[PDB]
Design a binder for this molecule. Structure first.
Ligand SMILES: *[C@@H]1O[C@H](CO)[C@@H](O[C@@H]2O[C@H](CO)[C@@H](O[C@@H]3O[C@H](CO[C@H]4O[C@H](CO)[C@@H](O)[C@H](O)[C@@H]4O)[C@@H](O)[C@H](O[C@H]4O[C@H](CO)[C@@H](O)[C@H](O)[C@@H]4O[C@H]4O[C@H](CO)[C@@H](O)[C@H](O)[C@@H]4O[C@H]4O[C@H](CO)[C@@H](O)[C@H](O)[C@@H]4O)[C@@H]3O)[C@H](O)[C@H]2NC(C)=O)[C@H](O)[C@H]1NC(C)=O
Ligand SMILES: *[C@@H]1O[C@H](CO)[C@@H](O[C@@H]2O[C@H](CO)[C@@H](O[C@@H]3O[C@H](CO)[C@@H](O)[C@H](O[C@H]4O[C@H](CO)[C@@H](O)[C@H](O)[C@@H]4O)[C@@H]3O)[C@H](O)[C@H]2NC(C)=O)[C@H](O)[C@H]1NC(C)=O
Ligand SMILES: *[C@@H]1O[C@H](CO)[C@@H](O[C@@H]2O[C@H](CO)[C@@H](O[C@@H]3O[C@H](CO[C@H]4O[C@H](CO)[C@@H](O)[C@H](O)[C@@H]4O)[C@@H](O)[C@H](O)[C@@H]3O)[C@H](O)[C@H]2NC(C)=O)[C@H](O)[C@H]1NC(C)=O
Ligand SMILES: *[C@@H]1O[C@H](CO)[C@@H](O[C@@H]2O[C@H](CO)[C@@H](O[C@@H]3O[C@H](CO)[C@@H](O)[C@H](O)[C@@H]3O)[C@H](O)[C@H]2NC(C)=O)[C@H](O)[C@H]1NC(C)=O
Ligand SMILES: *[C@@H]1O[C@H](CO)[C@@H](O[C@@H]2O[C@H](CO)[C@@H](O[C@@H]3O[C@H](CO)[C@@H](O)[C@H](O)[C@@H]3O)[C@H](O)[C@H]2NC(C)=O)[C@H](O)[C@H]1NC(C)=O
Ligand SMILES: *[C@@H]1O[C@H](CO)[C@@H](O[C@@H]2O[C@H](CO)[C@@H](O[C@@H]3O[C@H](CO)[C@@H](O)[C@H](O)[C@@H]3O)[C@H](O)[C@H]2NC(C)=O)[C@H](O)[C@H]1NC(C)=O
Ligand SMILES: *[C@@H]1O[C@H](CO)[C@@H](O[C@@H]2O[C@H](CO)[C@@H](O[C@@H]3O[C@H](CO)[C@@H](O)[C@H](O)[C@@H]3O)[C@H](O)[C@H]2NC(C)=O)[C@H](O)[C@H]1NC(C)=O
Ligand SMILES: *[C@@H]1O[C@H](CO)[C@@H](O[C@@H]2O[C@H](CO)[C@@H](O)[C@H](O)[C@H]2NC(C)=O)[C@H](O)[C@H]1NC(C)=O
Ligand SMILES: *[C@@H]1O[C@H](CO)[C@@H](O[C@@H]2O[C@H](CO)[C@@H](O)[C@H](O)[C@H]2NC(C)=O)[C@H](O)[C@H]1NC(C)=O
Ligand SMILES: *[C@@H]1O[C@H](CO)[C@@H](O[C@@H]2O[C@H](CO)[C@@H](O)[C@H](O)[C@H]2NC(C)=O)[C@H](O)[C@H]1NC(C)=O
Ligand SMILES: *[C@@H]1O[C@H](CO)[C@@H](O[C@@H]2O[C@H](CO)[C@@H](O)[C@H](O)[C@H]2NC(C)=O)[C@H](O)[C@H]1NC(C)=O
Ligand SMILES: *[C@@H]1O[C@H](CO)[C@@H](O)[C@H](O)[C@H]1NC(C)=O
Ligand SMILES: *[C@@H]1O[C@H](CO)[C@@H](O)[C@H](O)[C@H]1NC(C)=O
Ligand SMILES: *[C@@H]1O[C@H](CO)[C@@H](O)[C@H](O)[C@H]1NC(C)=O
Ligand SMILES: *[C@@H]1O[C@H](CO)[C@@H](O)[C@H](O)[C@H]1NC(C)=O
Lengths: 110, 176, 373, 127
């Protein structure tokens, strides 16, 4: 099997600040990585597919890059509705044996 | 020769027989030598006839040695013989499709007469054997007429049509 | 004889080409000094549709496709011996799908130790008719294993005139193999310029070009031969009559790209002694597919998505497969729709000149001697 | 264009069989694949399986093949998830998930492994 590792557990941010994330795979993987969003009790909306192409409706505030093992992500002008759990789900093995990722979350100062 | 019956709308399945068990070439021709179907290697070729979208075949049984002919939405115009050309044989069967119904759709009363309608294929001689749940086993030729249609005559009468010791059952719309 | 024949192709043994890998593991190098012994005044009934040699090549190519293009999902039927609801459940197989290189290589079927291969040399040969210039060899000429429908690609050309071959005419069941005497070219590309994957929630598009000023010449000779078989009727070409997508359109392969080229602007014209086309670049619209129907038996398949760009096929056209539409409704016409699909018919157009025979040496004859006892 | 409609949130004793359905509209059911993602309370997104609508095939994780199976009743356009041999670890939220494929009927298939359309989630809990 494979394993996706996240560097932080949460992400210390603030509104109007830039946020970056990174996903690391246990093995080698090409540009077949998609980034997912996650809101509590909602549907995990798609963000990027293939690590460099936005979906139909994803704003320009969300972007990312990287290949091989490291896979970056950038969030320009962090809005109020952009505070949601993020996920990393790899898909590059045939037959499909991909499992999951850890995921990060934005923080709230309190 | 083998012969089956159609029900004007359902499907039909005319089969060929093979013994080599190797999934070889075969065809289907009408009485005018027109192609309908046929294997071409392992693919399927629909012949240039009036049954393009209606002809079909069960691809999963070719390697066993059975080459059926699946024709959906049967019409009276397709009542014709067909030819099998598996190895060098000329296995021929005949198709006879017709439809049995009535004229008065829904507006009917108690104490009225009933009329039937049969569109037999051109060049045939059918025998309609009516049967009713009340025991009215009406026997006659092609056209049949009933002089009593009351509340007791309710229920879809199953009038079967026999020809060459082959018969198929149908239904009758009776709305009173 | 009904023997096996060892192949003999000029391989490379170093590149990652599929056919070079297959030819290295099961083929021998080509004969550097071939010998064709010309026989005298002999005549042999060369039947071609009952040739058992073509039944072997077809089983030696299926073993190559199971070593070349491994399908991602190989859905194939499988029935159970139950008389008649027959139990016929599918059996899928999931394998890795690496996009590999793909290019045919000319192979040579050679006779084993103890047998010989005859070869006619008549410029017409007629098919299942006995010729007279029979010469023996030990290995056939260059044969490419190209798998295609409606248009026989890369291969040998006719000697002097476009000849037509068919097992039996006027029975509209046997395909008519037409061999050309001049190589009609064809170029099929898609450089890059179409990275648009989907349209709504193009990379699946390609095209081909045929020299109209050159293609009309070869078609003009085909109708000259077909009218010799039917002088009073009218030669009317048409598109396919429907069926599976590998038969309705043209289908060839180039590096895993399974081009399904629509050939309606190539057979639409009706004919007589005069033309009905126009008056250079006939845009033959093609399309890469992913869920195909295997030619090596019943059952679908599914391959990996196409390559990014620069897919070129600098082919040739040596043959042409044509069917016929006869009947009692045929009011003085001749319909020649494109057929093909049976790959055995693709190689019978190549292995028509040969036949595998053995030498029986006994003989009995009457004479005037007598054994002294 | 497409929508999803999960089944009802039903609780069952660990050991029985579980069935989850999902309907759709907006596009023909055999035009694109469908997957299944497991949402456990407080855990991540575990991948259950994937099913192609045309080719009735399925691929799963190595720790679920002896307990799950997916069918796609194209006559009713409703994917099913027969999850038998229920245990205590299997308490999670199940939901369908789809992703469009360009013209798979004609053969222009794409094999999109990502996920775009999602349902809402049915609650599965053992006692
Ligand atoms: C009938 O007969 C005719 C012959 O008469 C057949 O025609 C042949 O058809 C072949 C395939 O259709 C075709 O083969 C291609 O040739 C290309 C050009 O070859 C020349 O260049 C190479 C490199 O310079 C020389 O070594 C060689 O000697 C030639 O002079 C090759 O480049 C092609 O290989 C690429 O395509 C295949 C397709 O699957 C790949 O598998 C293969 O690995 C190569 O892939 C690379 O290139 C593609 C192009 O876009 C990339 O998308 C891909 O990602 C790879 O890219 C990497 O490498 C490139 C460098 O190449 C680099 O820039 C990039 O960044 C990546 O790192 C292929 O081999 C024959 O040439 C052609 N013959 C003739 C004479 O025309 C015809 O097919 C027959 N009919 C049938 C039905 O078979
Ligand atoms: C190449 O082959 C194709 C084979 O499909 C052929 O196309 C079809 O030919 C048939 C034969 O004539 C056409 O069928 C008729 O066409 C006339 C002319 O439009 C229609 O009016 C007819 O429809 C009426 O008649 C039927 C009974 O005959 C009724 O049942 C029907 O309800 C209508 O009242 C009839 O369809 C057919 O239209 C064409 N189809 C196409 C798409 O062309 C084609 O002609 C061949 N090519 C050449 C050059 O010959
Ligand atoms: C090469 O292929 C040719 C066609 O592809 C073959 O031609 C076939 O030749 C035979 C011999 O004449 C023809 O058979 C005739 O069929 C008619 C029609 O039969 C109907 O009527 C009779 C009574 O008349 C009835 O008993 C039947 O059931 C039919 O209803 C007969 O009347 C004739 O007597 C004769 O048998 C074929 O029709 C013909 N094929 C076609 C498609 O026209 C030819 O044989 C092949 N060559 C070789 C060497 O085999
Ligand atoms: C009967 O079959 C034999 C088979 O060999 C035919 O002999 C071959 O004839 C061709 C001519 O069409 C020869 O090609 C020529 O070769 C010479 C010398 O190599 C060269 O100068 C020419 O440019 C041309 O290429 C061929 O060599 C010859 N075969 C052999 C082994 O010499 C013969 O022609 C056939 N008979 C008839 C009437 O066709
Ligand atoms: C190959 O390319 C040819 C290009 O001509 C395609 O033929 C065209 O196909 C369209 C789609 O069916 C036809 O349009 C239809 O016309 C009928 C009237 O006959 C109309 O009732 C329909 O609503 C529809 O508009 C079009 O007529 C036809 N062209 C001709 C000259 O007949 C062909 O479909 C392509 N085939 C493949 C396998 O790609
Ligand atoms: C059968 O298919 C052939 C395929 O080539 C058809 O020939 C094509 O016919 C069209 C007629 O619209 C030609 O278009 C012409 O283009 C010139 C220049 O742009 C323009 O001045 C004309 O008004 C006309 O639009 C087209 O060039 C020609 N193909 C080639 C390669 O030259 C033929 O018409 C088809 N026949 C039938 C009965 O469908
Ligand atoms: C009909 O189709 C043929 C090929 O399908 C077209 O030939 C192609 O024409 C272009 C335009 O001139 C050629 O590009 C040029 O090639 C030369 C030689 O390398 C290069 O130096 C130039 O800078 C330019 O790139 C192309 O090579 C040629 N194809 C081949 C195989 O040689 C033809 O133009 C088409 N007819 C019409 C009227 O468009
Ligand atoms: C060309 O091939 C055809 C068959 O494909 C041969 O035709 C038969 O020939 C024999 C004797 O020559 C005749 O008795 C038959 O009646 C012919 N049948 C048909 C359907 O034509 C023909 O002989 C071959 N040509 C040559 C020169 O041998
Ligand atoms: C298909 O492409 C081939 C080459 O890939 C073309 O062959 C060349 O044609 C030009 C004339 O336009 C000649 O000057 C060249 O010498 C040819 N090449 C060679 C190697 O001889 C061919 O013309 C193209 N045909 C079509 C129909 O597009
Ligand atoms: C195949 O044929 C098409 C149609 O002629 C070619 O497209 C033309 O290309 C020339 C030069 O590249 C242009 O001047 C024309 O305007 C193009 N026509 C159209 C309708 O766009 C195409 O280039 C040919 N393929 C190759 C490889 O040359
Ligand atoms: C496709 O056709 C071309 C010609 O249109 C063939 O090129 C010829 O190849 C022979 C082989 O030795 C040469 O003798 C000729 O001089 C070539 N002619 C031209 C104009 O290039 C080409 O070989 C054919 N392709 C295949 C695979 O047979
Ligand atoms: C073949 O026949 C011709 C006809 O004259 C003759 O000259 C020749 O010798 C014959 N061939 C043999 C090997 O005898
Ligand atoms: C075929 O086309 C060429 C031009 O490409 C032309 O010279 C020739 O005359 C045409 N053939 C006929 C029979 O018109
Ligand atoms: C039919 O063709 C023949 C030659 O095969 C010819 O003699 C005859 O005149 C033609 N028919 C007509 C009506 O011209
Ligand atoms: C075909 O051409 C001939 C002359 O070669 C002519 O007599 C005949 O009428 C033509 N056919 C049609 C349908 O016009």
């Amino acid at each position: 099997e494979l394993e996706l590792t996240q560097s932080p557990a949460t992400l210390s941010v603030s509104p109007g600040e830039r946020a970056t994330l990174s996903c690391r795979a246990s093995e080698s993987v090409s540009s077949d990585l998609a980034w997912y969003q996650q809101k509590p009790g909602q549907a995990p909306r798609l963000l990027i597919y293939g690590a460099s192409t936005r979906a139909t409706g994803v704003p320009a505030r969300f972007s990312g890059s990287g290949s091989g093992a490291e896979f970056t992500l950038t969030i320009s002008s962090l809005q109020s509705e952009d505070f949601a759990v993020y996920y990393c789900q790899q898909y590059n093995n045939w037959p499909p044996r991909y499992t999951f990722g850890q995921g990060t979350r934005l923080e709230i100062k309190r | 020769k083998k012969v089956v019956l159609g029900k004007k709308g359902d499907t039909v399945e005319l089969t060929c027989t093979a013994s080599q068990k190797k999934s070889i070439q075969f065809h289907w021709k009408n009485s005018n030598q027109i192609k309908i179907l046929g294997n071409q290697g392992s693919f399927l070729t629909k012949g240039p006839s009036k049954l393009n979208d209606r002809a079909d075949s069960r691809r999963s049984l070719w390697d066993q040695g059975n080459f059926p002919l699946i024709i959906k939405n049967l019409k009276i115009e397709d009542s014709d013989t067909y030819i099998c050309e598996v190895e060098d044989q000329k296995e021929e069967v005949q198709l006879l499709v017709f439809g049995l119904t009535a004229n008065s759709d829904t507006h009917l009363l108690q104490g009225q007469s009933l009329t039937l309608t049969l569109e037999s294929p051109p060049g045939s001689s059918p025998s309609v054997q009516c049967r009713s749940p009340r025991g009215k086993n009406i026997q006659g030729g092609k056209t049949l007429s009933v002089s009593q249609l009351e509340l007791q005559d309710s229920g879809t009468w199953t009038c079967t049509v026999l020809q060459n010791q082959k018969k198929v059952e149908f239904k009758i719309d009776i709305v009173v | 004889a009904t023997t096996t024949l060892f192949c003999a192709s000029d391989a490379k043994a170093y590149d990652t080409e599929v056919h070079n890998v297959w030819a290295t593991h099961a083929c021998v190098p080509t004969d550097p000094n071939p010998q064709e012994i010309v026989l005298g005044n002999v005549t042999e009934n060369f039947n071609m549709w009952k040739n058992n040699m073509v039944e072997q090549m077809h089983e030696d190519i299926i073993s190559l496709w199971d070593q070349s293009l491994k399908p991602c999902v190989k859905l194939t039927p499988l029935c159970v011996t139950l008389n008649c609801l027959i139990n016929c459940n599918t059996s899928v197989i999931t394998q890795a799908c690496p996009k590999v290189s793909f290019e045919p290589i000319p192979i040579h079927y050679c006779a084993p130790a103890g047998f010989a291969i005859l070869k006619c040399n008549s410029k017409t040969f007629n098919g299942s008719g006995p010729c007279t210039n029979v010469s023996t060899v030990q290995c056939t000429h260059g044969i490419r294993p190209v798998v295609s429908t409606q248009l026989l690609l890369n291969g040998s050309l006719a000697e002097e005139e476009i000849v037509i071959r068919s097992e039996n005419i006027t029975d509209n069941a046997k395909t008519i193999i037409v061999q050309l005497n001049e190589a009609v070219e064809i170029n099929c590309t898609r450089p890059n310029n179409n990275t648009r994957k989907s349209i709504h929630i193009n990379i699946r598009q390609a095209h081909c070009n045929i020299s109209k000023a050159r293609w009309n010449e070869t078609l003009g000779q085909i109708v000259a031969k077909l009218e010799e078989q039917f002088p009073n009727k009218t030669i009317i070409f048409n598109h396919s009559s429907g069926g599976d997508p590998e038969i309705v359109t043209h289908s060839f392969n180039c590096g895993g790209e399974f081009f399904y080229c629509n050939t309606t602007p190539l057979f639409n014209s009706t004919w007589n002694n005069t033309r009905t086309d126009d008056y250079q670049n006939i845009t033959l619209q093609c399309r890469i597919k992913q869920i195909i129907n295997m030619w090596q038996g019943v059952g679908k398949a599914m391959y990996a998505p196409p390559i990014r760009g620069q897919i070129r096929c600098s082919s040739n056209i040596t043959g042409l497969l044509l069917t016929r539409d006869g009947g009692r409704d045929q009011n003085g016409t001749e319909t020649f729709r494109p057929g093909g699909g049976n790959m055995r018919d693709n190689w019978r157009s190549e292995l028509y000149k040969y036949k595998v025979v053995k030498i029986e040496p006994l003989g009995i004859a009457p004479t005037a001697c007598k054994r002294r006892v | 264009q497409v929508q999803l409609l999960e089944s009802g949130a039903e609780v069952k004793k660990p050991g029985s069989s579980v069935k989850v359905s999902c309907k759709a509209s907006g596009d023909t059911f055999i035009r694109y694949s469908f997957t299944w993602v497991r949402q456990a309370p407080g855990q991540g997104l575990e991948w259950m399986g994937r099913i192609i609508t045309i080719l009735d095939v399925a691929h799963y994780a190595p720790h679920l093949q002896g307990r799950v199976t997916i069918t796609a009743d194209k006559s009713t356009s409703t994917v099913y998830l027969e999850l038998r041999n229920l245990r205590s670890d299997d308490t999670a939220v199940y939901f369908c998930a789809g992703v469009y494929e360009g013209e798979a009927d004609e053969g222009e298939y794409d094999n999109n492994g990502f996920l775009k359309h999602w349902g809402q989630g049915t609650l599965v809990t053992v006692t």
